[PDB]
């Protein structure tokens, strides 16, 4: 439905060019039709099959048989932490064991992402002069190309920025938590009728209620790699200081949302699941699709309606849904969306946050007329269901500019108000559920099913299994990043080491901006209370006379099998610090360059243990005290 004249100007007014031309027809079997995006949610084959691949990744990394075998050891270790009454985690409870499994897997992925960001910040600061050169000199090139240049000019250890490259280099602890696999083959619905016998409580303690089963079956975790975050950070940065501020600003928001996601399962209410509505007739002249996204790790949802070639969206609050309607009040409007449309409902799990989903929706709305209907649906469904960035470079650039804007201080959505409000809604819901269950059944039964111990993800006392790949002189080193902290109070860190040898000595060192501590222990199969901290309101800590925001803990042990680090706050429900923004992150600066230094346990001496500063050591050889 359009032809062009030969020997004419190739320039066009529009900046985003559709693969199918203005005729809106692509001959099948051509290259243009081959590189067209594919609908994943709409196509039953691709949605069915995608779930198979995600299930395989979860099962290969985390095995249900392994988790059930380690339940007894974990229960003993959690009892070894002598916690005040009303604050102990009792893994013999079926419900409490479930939340630990979800919490442990979710925290480990978040913790690993923070570690990768720390090394990335270290590499950027090391090459400040050449990083500032690339940012200032080149501005017309694409954000992806700028990200590739930055990762090349630094020792990023992950040069690829594409989605295929990101999946190629990814640890076992990063793969998202697949909810259905966790809840498989687990007893539901123990009926104990007016029996307070100790045997009756024991069997009831062994099962879970049906509400918890629905929550797990509609749960999927989102963890954003630092390589995907570099594009929004470097799209408008003019200096390395600005770029580092953006990187920390985004991960602070992702930090808050991940904590919020876990609290939804703890509260004791059924979390809604995202769905897509399609017309009943597959071969319909008038085509419309509706997407309702309910991010579990977030506080704001998104409804995207594509009617013909017109795209409209609405952002709604996930709190305050007192009425029968699932959607709360709408915070940002982008047209009129009809959620009463009748059609086939297909359920899906999003792998991108609300910010990333919103960023693409604004970009598509800008290019509503330039792109065809298939391209609009394909790009949107690929990003939502696969976290795959569009091949259209012009569209990709616009998405990342919007991603930066929603994160920066000039965002149309004030996230702190909504994140704070969601926290208040969740705790109020938990209180209402507990008292409602207190009237129906006994107080003992209520504590079984909805525990008051867990609450938030980082408030909860959780364990993080560490993986070690570096061994020096027979001593394998296990890394753990202490901090940052979203809550203030007194916090304790413990380490458990199991190894084949009957007796052994293992060393733990804690790196700050000044120097290490060099603790040495010999106990096995029991937590050791390695180090104890205090956290200010702003999240900073005066560690040995210097304010710190994060520390690096390294554990050295010979012929070890598993090393676990436990964490517990002194008081239950530690109050949360305000989430940092771009201004807060650039206001103060800490040096993490010292975290890569490592010691050799084999050559250690008695005088070396204790708090030592860098001046005491000479250049290199951070193990021997004499300079």
């Amino acid at each position: 439905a359009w032809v062009t004249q030969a020997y004419s100007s190739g320039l066009s007014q529009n900046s985003i060019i559709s693969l199918t031309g203005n005729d809106r027809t692509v001959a099948d079997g051509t290259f243009n039709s081959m590189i067209m995006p594919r609908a994943v949610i709409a196509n039953e084959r691709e949605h069915f099959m995608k779930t198979r691949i995600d299930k395989i990744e979860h099962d290969l990394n985390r095995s249900a048989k392994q988790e059930m075998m380690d339940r007894q050891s974990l229960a003993e270790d959690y009892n070894a932490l002598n916690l005040a009454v009303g604050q102990e985690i009792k893994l013999d409870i079926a419900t409490q064991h479930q939340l630990n499994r979800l919490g442990s897997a979710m925290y480990k992925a978040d913790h690993e992402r923070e570690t990768e960001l720390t090394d990335l910040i270290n590499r950027i600061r090391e090459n400040e002069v050449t990083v500032n050169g690339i940012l200032e000199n080149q501005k017309a090139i694409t954000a992806a190309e700028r990200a590739d240049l930055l990762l090349e000019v630094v020792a990023s250890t992950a040069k690829s920025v594409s989605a295929a490259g990101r999946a190629a280099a990814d640890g076992s602890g990063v793969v998202p938590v697949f909810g259905p696999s966790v809840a498989n083959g687990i007893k539901v619905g123990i009926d104990i009728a007016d029996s307070v016998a100790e045997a009756a409580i024991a069997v009831k303690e062994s099962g879970i209620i049906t509400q918890l089963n629905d929550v797990y079956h509609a749960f999927q975790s989102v963890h954003v790699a630092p390589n995907d975050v570099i594009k929004p950070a470097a799209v408008v940065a003019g200096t390395s200081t600005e770029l580092i501020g953006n990187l920390q600003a985004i991960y602070s928001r992702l930090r808050s949302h991940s904590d919020i996601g876990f609290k939804k399962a703890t509260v004791g209410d059924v979390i809604p699941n995202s769905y897509m509505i399609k017309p009943v007739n597959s071969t319909e002249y008038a085509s419309w699709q509706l997407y309702v996204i309910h991010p579990v790790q977030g506080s704001l949802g998104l409804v995207v309606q594509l009617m013909g070639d017109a795209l409209t969206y609405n952002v709604f609050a996930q709190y305050g849904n007192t009425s029968a309607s699932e959607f709360g009040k709408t915070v940002l409007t982008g047209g009129a969306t009809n959620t009463a449309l009748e059609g086939t409902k297909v359920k899906f799990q999003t792998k991108v946050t609300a910010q990333q989903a919103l960023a693409l929706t604004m970009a598509l709305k800008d290019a509503a007329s330039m792109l065809s209907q298939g391209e609009l649906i394909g790009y949107f469904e690929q990003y939502i269901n696969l976290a795959l960035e569009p091949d259209n470079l012009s569209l990709q650039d616009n998405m990342h500019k919007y991603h930066h804007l929603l994160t920066s201080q000039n965002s149309p959505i004030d996230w702190n108000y909504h994140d704070e409000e969601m926290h208040k809604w969740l705790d109020s819901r938990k209180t209402t559920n507990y008292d409602a269950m207190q009237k129906k059944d006994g107080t003992v039964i209520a504590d079984i099913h909805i525990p008051k111990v867990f609450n938030d993800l980082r408030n909860t006392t959780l364990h993080c299994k560490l993986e070690g790949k570096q061994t020096i002189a027979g001593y394998t080193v296990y890394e753990y990043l202490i901090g940052p902290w979203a809550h203030y109070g007194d916090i304790d860190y413990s380490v458990v080491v199991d190894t084949l040898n009957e007796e052994t000595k293992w060393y733990c060192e804690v790196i700050g901006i000044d120097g290490h501590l060099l603790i040495e222990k010999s106990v096995q199969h029991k937590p050791e209370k390695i180090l104890e901290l205090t956290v200010n309101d702003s999240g900073v800590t005066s560690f040995n006379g210097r304010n710190h925001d994060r520390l690096k803990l390294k554990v050295y042990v010979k012929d070890s099998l598993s090393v676990k680090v436990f964490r517990n706050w002194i008081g239950i429900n530690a109050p949360r610090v305000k989430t940092k923004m771009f201004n807060d992150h650039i206001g103060v600066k800490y040096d993490y360059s010292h975290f890569d230094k490592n010691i050799s346990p084999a050559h250690l001496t008695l005088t070396d243990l204790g708090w030592h500063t860098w001046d005491q050591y000479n250049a290199g050889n951070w193990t021997n005290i004499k300079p």
Binding site: L500, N501, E502, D559, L561
Partner: peptide, 15 residues
């Protein structure tokens, strides 16, 4: 079972 772990446990049992 890993080779090292079998050797380690055999050493524990015998000695």
């Amino acid at each position: 079972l890993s080779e090292t772990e079998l050797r380690a446990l055999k050493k524990l049992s015998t000695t």
